[PDB]
From a paper:
The ethylene-forming enzyme (EFE) from the fungus Penicillium digitatum strain Pd1 was heterologously produced in Escherichia coli and its properties were compared to the extensively characterized bacterial enzyme from Pseudomonas savastanoi strain PK2. Both enzymes catalyze four reactions: the conversion of 2-oxoglutarate (2OG) to ethylene and CO2, oxidative decarboxylation of 2OG coupled to l-arginine (l-Arg) hydroxylation, uncoupled oxidative decarboxylation of 2OG, and the production of 3-hydroxypropionate (3-HP) from 2OG. The Pd1 EFE structure includes a double-stranded β-helix (DSBH, also known as the jellyroll or cupin fold) core, an architecture that is widely found in members of the Fe(II)/2OG-dependent oxygenases. The overall fold of Pd1 EFE is very similar to that of PK2 EFE with a Cα RMSD of 0.6 Å.
An AlphaFold model41 was used as a template for molecular replacement to solve the Pd1 EFE apoprotein crystal structure at a resolution of 3.5 Å. The Pd1 EFE crystals have a different morphology but the same space group (P212121) as the PK2 EFE. Although Pd1 EFE is predominantly a monomer in solution, the asymmetric unit contains four molecules (chains A, B, C, and D) with the overall Cα RMSD for the apoprotein structure ranging from 0.19 to 0.32 Å. We were unable to model several disordered regions of the apoprotein (chain A, residues 140-144, 237-249, 274-295; chain B, residues 139-147, 237-251, 274-294; chain C, residues 236-251, 277-295; and chain D, residues 139-150, 238-244, and 275-294). The metal-binding site of Pd1 EFE resembles what is found in most other Fe(II)/2OG-dependent oxygenases, with the metal coordinated by His251 and Asp253, that derive from the loop linking β3 and β4, along with His327 that is situated at the N-terminus of β7. Of these three regions, residues 270-290 are disordered in Chain A of the Pd1 EFE crystal structure.
Author numbering: 48 to 139, 145 to 236, 250 to 273, 296 to 407
């Protein structure tokens, strides 16, 4: 077993599926959607086989990840932006700290949303184009898989068409490039979390702890908090923790998210009788989570100094 030491968990026997290239509402899509829902309600997590074209993009993105983390520390620490939370975040012989490079929506300085000084909207601090192109193409392939999974959920739950896919139009998709060093419970604010890992392993989940073994050629998908809110605990939020192994581990964390301007509301079908009157504005939910997780960041201080949080109450940031 590739399980990190000093940890006690059960090995997971997850179901593996193959997503169709285009969800059309065929009887094959309805049967596949219902099978994925039962897997999420029983084990809390399922695996999806990568297409051979997606495997090439994962290898290119994994190569650009190791090339970035091989740079000197001061060259990586300079990858910070004052308008966007994307960039490098550190922990502390070779290395001994957990490093993360978040990639939010990359918008130039002349974009209307960045000119209006909206919170979290800004350029992405890429160190070079050699890292920007492969990681961007990897996010585009994960965006296609994330949308097909949402169409599977609407077909399995027999929801009205475009019930979930209409929220992710220009969605605030962001990717978290992780690196965990040698050994010598977190949540997830979103609809679906697509995670890909190497052969080292160290991912643990909590069914509705269980170790997720590394399987070549597949990525793992588990819902988050926003999915549980809309579905009335039908698809529960799966907590995840990472354990340090004997060797360095590289992994990805993709978040298929609604639009920054979209306001999610519970599904009236999945609620007995009347649904709650509560509504979550994702733009306010996203900024509140990053301002709490990264308080000492220059991005948070600028939002506080320039008082950009007052823009979250304007209707232009709530209609899309």
């Amino acid at each position: 077993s590739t399980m990190p030491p000093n940890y006690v968990a059960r090995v997971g026997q997850l179901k593996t599926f193959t997503l169709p290239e285009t969800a059309t509402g065929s009887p094959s899509d309805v049967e596949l959607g219902k099978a994925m829902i039962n897997a999420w309600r029983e084990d809390g997590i399922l695996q999806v086989s990568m297409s051979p074209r997606q495997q090439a993009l994962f290898e290119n993105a994994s190569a650009a990840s190791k090339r970035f983390f091989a740079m000197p520390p001061n060259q990586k620490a300079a990858c910070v932006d004052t308008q966007s939370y994307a960039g490098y975040i550190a922990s502390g012989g070779i290395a001994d700290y957990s490093e993360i490079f978040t990639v939010t929506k990359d918008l130039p300085l002349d974009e209307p949303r960045v000119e209006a000084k909206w919170p979290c909207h800004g350029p992405c601090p890429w160190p070079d184009v050699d890292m920007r192109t492969p990681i961007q193409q990897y996010m585009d392939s994960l965006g296609k898989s994330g949308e097909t999974l949402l169409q599977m959920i609407e077909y399995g739950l027999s929801l009205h068409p475009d019930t979930l896919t209409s929220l992710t139009k220009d969605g605030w998709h962001h990717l978290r490039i992780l690196r965990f060093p040698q050994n010598n419970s977190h949540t997830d604010y979103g609809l679906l979390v697509i995670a890909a890992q190497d052969e080292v392993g160290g991912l643990f989940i909590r069914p509705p702890w269980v170790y997720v073994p590394p399987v070549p050629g597949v990525f793992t998908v588990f819902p988050g908090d926003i999915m549980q809110f809309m579905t009335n605990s039908y698809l529960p939020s799966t907590p995840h923790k990472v354990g340090l192994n004997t060797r360095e581990r590289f992994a990805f964390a993709y978040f298929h998210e609604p639009s920054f301007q979209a306001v999610v509301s519970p599904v009236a079908k999945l609620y007995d009788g009347q649904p709650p009157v509560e509504k979550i504005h994702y733009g306010t939910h996203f900024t509140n989570m990053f301002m709490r997780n990264y308080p000492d960041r220059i991005t948070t201080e600028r939002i506080i100094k320039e008082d950009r949080l007052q823009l979250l109450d304007r209707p232009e940031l709530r209609t899309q």
